[PDB]
Amino acid sequence: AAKIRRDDEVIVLTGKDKGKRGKVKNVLSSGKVIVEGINLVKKHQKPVPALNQPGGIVEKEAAIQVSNVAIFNAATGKADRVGFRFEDGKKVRFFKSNSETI
Amino acid sequence: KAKELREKSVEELNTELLNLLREQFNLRMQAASGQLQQSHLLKQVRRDVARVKTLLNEKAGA
Amino acid sequence: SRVCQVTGKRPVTGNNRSHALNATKRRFLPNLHSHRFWVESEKRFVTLRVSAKGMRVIDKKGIDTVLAELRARGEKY
Amino acid sequence: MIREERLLKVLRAPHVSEKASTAMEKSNTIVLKVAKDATKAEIKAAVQKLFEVEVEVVNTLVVKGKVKRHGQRIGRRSDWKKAYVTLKEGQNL
Amino acid sequence: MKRTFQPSVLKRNRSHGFRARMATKNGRQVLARRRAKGRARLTVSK
RNA sequence: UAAGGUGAUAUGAACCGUUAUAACCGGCGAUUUCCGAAUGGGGAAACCCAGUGUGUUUCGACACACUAUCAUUAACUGAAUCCAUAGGUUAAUGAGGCGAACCGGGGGAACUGAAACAUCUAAGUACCCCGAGGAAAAGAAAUCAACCGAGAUUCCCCCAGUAGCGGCGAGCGAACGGGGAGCAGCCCAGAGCCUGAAUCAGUGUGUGUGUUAGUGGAAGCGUCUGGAAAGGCGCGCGAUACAGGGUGACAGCCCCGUACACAAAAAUGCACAUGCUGUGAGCUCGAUGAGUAGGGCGGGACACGUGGUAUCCUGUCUGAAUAUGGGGGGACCAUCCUCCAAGGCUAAAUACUCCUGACUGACCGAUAGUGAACCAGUACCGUGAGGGAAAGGCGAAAAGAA
RNA sequence: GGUGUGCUGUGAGGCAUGCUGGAGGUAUCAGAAGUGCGAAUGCUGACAUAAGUAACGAUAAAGCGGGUGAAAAGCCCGCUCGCCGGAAGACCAAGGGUUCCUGUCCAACGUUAAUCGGGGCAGGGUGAGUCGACCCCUAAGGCGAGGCCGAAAGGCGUAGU
RNA sequence: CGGUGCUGAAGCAACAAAUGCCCUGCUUCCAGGAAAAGCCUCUAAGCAUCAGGUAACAUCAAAUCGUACCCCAAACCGACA
Ligand SMILES: [Mg+2]
Ligand SMILES: [Mg+2]
Ligand SMILES: [Mg+2]
Ligand SMILES: [Mg+2]
Ligand SMILES: [Mg+2]
Ligand SMILES: [Mg+2]
Ligand SMILES: [Mg+2]
Ligand SMILES: [Mg+2]
Ligand SMILES: [Mg+2]
Ligand SMILES: [Mg+2]
Ligand SMILES: [Mg+2]
Ligand SMILES: [Mg+2]
Ligand SMILES: [Mg+2]
Ligand SMILES: [Mg+2]
Ligand SMILES: [Mg+2]
Ligand SMILES: [Mg+2]
Ligand SMILES: [Mg+2]
Ligand SMILES: [Mg+2]
Ligand SMILES: [Mg+2]
Ligand SMILES: [Mg+2]
Ligand SMILES: [Mg+2]
Ligand SMILES: [Mg+2]
Ligand SMILES: [Mg+2]
Ligand SMILES: [Mg+2]
Ligand SMILES: [Mg+2]
Ligand SMILES: [Mg+2]
Ligand SMILES: [Mg+2]
Ligand SMILES: [Mg+2]
Ligand SMILES: [Mg+2]
Ligand SMILES: [Mg+2]
Ligand SMILES: [Mg+2]
Ligand SMILES: [Mg+2]
Ligand SMILES: [Mg+2]
Ligand SMILES: [Mg+2]
Ligand SMILES: [Mg+2]
Ligand SMILES: [Mg+2]
Ligand SMILES: [Mg+2]
Ligand SMILES: [Mg+2]
């Protein structure tokens, strides 16, 4: 019943990364997703003597609201909305624009 | 699990119950000594002990 | 307690009214007495704590009829 | 006897400490965390069966849990029973 | 000076303990009120 | 139902799962230590100590089950004392405790008002006690009426602050009758004939409709400002969906929903139908609630404070008639009218909300609103009953400062 | 909302605007009020004053050397001195409940400083046939099958416990 | 540098002496000084081969809970070291 799922190719609708595309790394329970290369932050990670891991300014992907991304319909090269229907006995997703099953 | 276990007799499950309990006891000693890296094994053996005792209590009634 | 075993009479509350009509709470106790009744059907004596009116009831309805109702109500004797 | 299913539950952990170590190498005594309701009879049978050694005598004591303070809230650790199990002279572990 | 509270856990339990409260109907109403209020400690105890 | 999961502070670790034995949600099961009515005995609640019977044996022991009281029924026993009875034992069934209000009953204040105060008021209130149910109680005329009639009970609006009661003070305060909500009538006190025929209950079955998880669910882009667009401007589209919430500022068309259309293996409510079991309908002829009605004395209840006081209840002492009879119509009598007490049962309209869901607010917005927006009946105070707080906001995102 | 300024009305007030603030506000005409505070020895919170004032809790008493340390009158070690010694020593019960021991830390707590502590954090520590409890037995007393009594609740009490 | 290890002489007599012990005694007085069990003994019912008792030896068992620390005290009762 989730429209945006892991490994989907989405395009960002709002924010500083508007218009950029990427793949959904993983979905968080709070209704946020992590899209690789999207919404990067510079975290000041401090060193830990356990593992002797040094500090440094690391760039990571920050979680983004799932309503701020839309699944990317490569057939039309635009964002699109997702619907649901049963093909044989299983629920599938399809693009709202051209009713093509994802 | 819980399906191969149902295909066993009452006396066979009792042997399987002791094996799990001995297995569970060994894990506690390893976990206490700090030699157990796979801590997830503790919950596993604890859950299937519950599965065995569930069937024994079921086969007792029928 | 002060309850007649035959009629069920029990203490009731009222007022003492003086001449100036001052009202103070009081009770009216029943005229209870322990009395041994000879039941001929059993050739035996049965003692009951009855009011004086209860004895009038017994000599009118008969002791056996009264004893039948006490069993019907569950009271022991 | 005592059922083995019961014996497989009374022993919890071997207590490790400085006093436990010297008791092992000076009096041939092991120190164990045992179940709260374990008796000296149960502890003796369990060690002789599970560790396959001969037990001389068992001494037990109940340890009272400390009252710690997590941040701003106060808590209390659980009480547990400690057993001093003396083995025969010619036994190892 | 000798103050008023001279503690003794035996007298404390015999006077305000749980079984003392459960003995009479008035003590049981005390427990009822404390359960209704939601007290964490009904009576004196360890 | 699903591609994500292993409750929260709260990361991490070790793992699980991804087309269906991950997880999650629901039905039904299983497990369910100890205390607590606590029920084997005891006890300073969460502990101590048993008894009996069994299954176990590695003779150290071990496992399980049972063992409270009272009530009713039954069986067997069984004194003084011949019979008997009391008593005793066993068995079966039931009960006990808790819970916010509402309900019936048993008891029942004072402050206060009267500008003091005793009758009176407050008030049959607060409170205590007992009992019960989803409601309870009441209820099928020994009722009213007025010479015309009505036709059980309960609740609402009138009647009416009237008639009355009242140190005739303070105050208390109807009924008749009318308009409404709701509407239902039956049984025993007894035989017979017919008979098991209406009816209800129990227990199945089937059908229908709920409830307990759910499924689908329309339609937008461009540009400007800006950290960010849902805003401005432009041009579109949906609407049985412009309830609402969220999303980096204010979104019908981003998300969750919403209108609408659907959905149950299993349990369960309600209806129906049907089966089983118990239950007995109909007719004729009889019967018609006695220490009762009434009375004396003392109280109480009726709006009615004993007054000229009817009516009702009864602690005490009495005591009828019994349908050729009896009750009532506000002292009482006569006449007339009307009803049939001393045996019961009975749905609805009414009262309430500890609790569950949905929705609403010219209700509050952190000294407010619950005492408690926060780990609050907590910290703290008290021997105890009991009392009882303070304390919300980084940011869009921790990007929480290497 | 806050904080200034200017203007304006007879007044309660109003308007405009700089700065702050960073998301709501609301004309007009009506409607409804938890509608206006300086007083109530008002209530709650905050902050003053006295004032860097009194006090630092027995007049048994300290001195020095060394150590540790960012820092030593107070800690550690040493040498003197002083005080208690029918206690200011040692040990139980009661009561408390981890205050015990080791490592570590010094914000707060300690009436000063603190490297120290009964303070914070972590770890450790309580071993019983003979000690105590439990157990057996009873005292005062409690409860109390039946029982007697009592409007109810309950009271008393036998066997017992 | 706190402590740890090893070794180890004499280890007697006299006198004094308790409010402690003998003493739950003795003496004396009036105000006349718990209970029950353990323990010893006696039989009834009953049991009489038995059972049971006494003695010896052997063997087994003795569970559970408390046990740190403070006590004219900075840890208990006094809001306080
Ligand atoms: Mg030993
Ligand atoms: Mg011990
Ligand atoms: Mg006392
Ligand atoms: Mg009991
Ligand atoms: Mg019990
Ligand atoms: Mg006889
Ligand atoms: Mg008065
Ligand atoms: Mg009066
Ligand atoms: Mg019910
Ligand atoms: Mg009724
Ligand atoms: Mg859906
Ligand atoms: Mg949609
Ligand atoms: Mg969005
Ligand atoms: Mg008249
Ligand atoms: Mg007529
Ligand atoms: Mg508040
Ligand atoms: Mg505020
Ligand atoms: Mg408050
Ligand atoms: Mg401004
Ligand atoms: Mg003010
Ligand atoms: Mg003023
Ligand atoms: Mg001041
Ligand atoms: Mg001065
Ligand atoms: Mg001065
Ligand atoms: Mg001074
Ligand atoms: Mg000082
Ligand atoms: Mg110095
Ligand atoms: Mg501490
Ligand atoms: Mg110390
Ligand atoms: Mg200081
Ligand atoms: Mg400390
Ligand atoms: Mg009794
Ligand atoms: Mg008694
Ligand atoms: Mg000790
Ligand atoms: Mg000690
Ligand atoms: Mg001491
Ligand atoms: Mg001392
Ligand atoms: Mg002192």
Side-chain angles (χ1 to χ4, degrees):
Chain A
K3 295 179 177 179
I4 296 321
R5 300 176 183 180
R6 199 178 175 268
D7 309 61
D8 298 338
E9 175 67 29
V10 305
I11 178 177
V12 176
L13 299 180
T14 59
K16 63 177 179 177
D17 283 357
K18 191 182 31 203
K20 297 184 178 181
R21 297 164 47 189
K23 188 159 52 186
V24 176
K25 290 271 298 182
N26 75 116
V27 184
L28 306 185
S29 45
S30 42
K32 298 178 181 178
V33 300
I34 290 185
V35 186
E36 37 85 18
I38 297 307
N39 197 24
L40 297 178
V41 303
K42 308 170 184 177
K43 167 143 194 57
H44 300 68
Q45 186 176 179
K46 50 191 58 181
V48 46
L51 211 180
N52 232 16
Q53 178 186 185
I57 303 178
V58 192
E59 279 203 352
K60 325 181 310 172
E61 272 87 0
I64 187 181
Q65 288 283 350
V66 74
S67 101
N68 292 11
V69 305
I71 190 132
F72 182 76
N73 188 16
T76 69
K78 297 179 177 299
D80 196 3
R81 301 190 305 277
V82 178
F84 295 102
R85 56 159 124 95
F86 306 88
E87 307 287 65
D88 315 48
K90 324 173 73 62
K91 181 190 305 180
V92 311
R93 300 181 298 168
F94 69 93
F95 298 101
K96 280 294 192 60
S97 78
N98 47 16
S99 37
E100 297 294 319
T101 299
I102 303 180
Chain B
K1 222 76 196 72
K3 53 193 328 300
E4 331 87 1
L5 290 211
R6 195 173 282 101
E7 319 315 333
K8 303 180 177 182
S9 68
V10 45
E11 57 94 6
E12 286 158 340
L13 293 176
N14 290 274
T15 76
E16 199 44 28
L17 179 59
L18 298 163
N19 299 334
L20 294 175
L21 290 178
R22 301 187 197 99
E23 187 32 61
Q24 188 183 49
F25 164 75
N26 295 327
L27 289 178
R28 290 207 314 268
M29 317 315 292
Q30 301 177 39
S33 99
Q35 265 63 59
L36 186 64
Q37 276 67 58
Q38 294 182 108
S39 61
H40 75 276
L41 296 177
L42 285 171
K43 185 212 290 283
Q44 286 194 3
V45 53
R46 185 169 64 252
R47 291 297 167 81
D48 44 66
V49 169
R51 258 179 282 270
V52 172
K53 303 183 73 66
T54 306
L55 299 186
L56 286 178
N57 187 104
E58 183 278 347
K59 295 190 181 302
Chain C
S1 34
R2 284 188 253 261
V3 179
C4 180
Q5 303 194 250
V6 170
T7 67
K9 283 170 167 288
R10 62 192 313 111
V12 296
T13 66
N15 287 327
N16 292 299
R17 305 313 289 245
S18 63
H19 183 261
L21 291 180
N22 302 123
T24 64
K25 282 298 186 172
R26 65 160 295 183
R27 317 173 76 202
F28 294 87
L29 308 185
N31 189 14
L32 295 186
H33 297 279
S34 199
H35 190 270
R36 305 187 308 116
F37 292 88
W38 168 257
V39 61
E40 184 58 342
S41 145
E42 268 82 349
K43 312 291 286 303
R44 189 170 46 100
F45 280 103
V46 176
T47 164
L48 290 174
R49 191 182 187 182
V50 300
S51 60
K53 189 201 194 69
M55 301 177 78
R56 299 225 316 160
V57 175
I58 287 183
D59 55 59
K60 178 182 181 179
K61 306 174 67 59
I63 176 63
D64 51 7
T65 305
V66 172
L67 288 201
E69 320 317 332
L70 264 62
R71 305 188 234 96
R73 301 187 311 184
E75 284 90 288
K76 303 330 298 162
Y77 58 90
Chain D
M1 296 78 38
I2 301 193
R3 304 196 311 176
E4 39 274 79
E5 43 273 30
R6 171 59 181 171
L7 295 180
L8 288 163
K9 300 173 175 297
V10 291
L11 300 186
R12 312 310 305 177
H15 194 56
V16 44
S17 80
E18 173 170 333
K19 179 176 182 180
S21 52
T22 167
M24 181 45 208
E25 61 99 12
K26 310 266 75 203
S27 35
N28 202 29
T29 295
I30 62 177
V31 187
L32 310 173
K33 294 187 70 271
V34 302
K36 191 59 164 51
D37 61 326
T39 67
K40 293 179 181 181
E42 296 174 338
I43 299 172
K44 178 177 182 182
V47 175
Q48 287 187 159
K49 174 178 244 39
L50 302 184
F51 292 157
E52 294 304 4
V53 305
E54 283 191 357
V55 168
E56 181 96 60
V57 72
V58 186
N59 289 22
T60 62
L61 62 96
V62 179
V63 182
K64 310 305 182 303
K66 296 185 180 178
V67 173
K68 297 306 209 168
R69 140 169 194 175
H70 200 84
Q72 277 242 306
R73 281 186 315 273
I74 65 95
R76 173 180 175 87
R77 295 175 176 171
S78 268
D79 301 339
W80 52 283
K81 184 175 290 187
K82 176 196 298 183
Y84 286 96
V85 191
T86 306
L87 313 178
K88 301 295 178 54
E89 52 290 340
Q91 321 260 301
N92 315 297
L93 206 294
Chain E
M1 323 165 57
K2 184 175 181 181
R3 293 310 176 181
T4 61
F5 181 53
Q6 306 299 322
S8 146
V9 315
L10 178 57
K11 304 214 302 180
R12 185 176 179 83
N13 294 339
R14 285 184 174 173
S15 324
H16 319 290
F18 178 82
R19 308 196 86 254
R21 295 271 192 253
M22 279 291 188
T24 66
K25 72 103 182 168
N26 289 127
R28 290 192 291 271
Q29 291 186 161
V30 169
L31 303 183
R33 293 198 302 264
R34 289 187 146 258
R35 286 197 180 99
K37 196 175 183 177
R39 287 282 192 178
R41 275 190 292 296
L42 288 187
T43 57
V44 297
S45 292
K46 206 191 67 177

